């Protein structure tokens, strides 16, 4: 009805901040926030 159109609009804004805060590092090197951000991708992959 009303909020399912706007919780999935709030989910997607939270997916765009997770792509923003990703930090690309050379040669397969990762800090510890990039590891917790690929554990967020799985949660954003099922909601969608």
């Amino acid at each position: 009805w009303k909020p399912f159109e706007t919780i999935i609009l709030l989910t997607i804004f939270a997916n765009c901040v997770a792509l923003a805060v990703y930090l690309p590092m050379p040669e397969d090197d990762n800090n510890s926030l990039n590891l917790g951000l690929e554990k967020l991708e799985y949660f954003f992959l099922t909601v969608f």
């Binding site: 590092m25 050379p26 040669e27 397969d28 090197d29």
Partner: protein, 98 residues
Amino acid sequence: WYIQGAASPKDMLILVDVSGSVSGLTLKLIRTSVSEMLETLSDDDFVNVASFNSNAQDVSCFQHLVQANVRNKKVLKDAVNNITAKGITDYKKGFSFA
């Protein structure tokens, strides 16, 4: 002459960070610092050189602290040069190995 009377002899151990982030201008700088750091070393000083990226290997053939005479230093300054950066940084296996 200045160095021997500056300070007492010493067993040093150079760690080199070889994780992927270092590759670039920074990796280039490290190979020239370690060679530079060695110039400082003397015969009475012992020294080995290790390197870590999620495992700590040792840069050359030595595996213990060696006398850092003209020859030994020449081996270490020739293995510091060929290093390639790849992999995850691990300061825990780098200081255990040290």
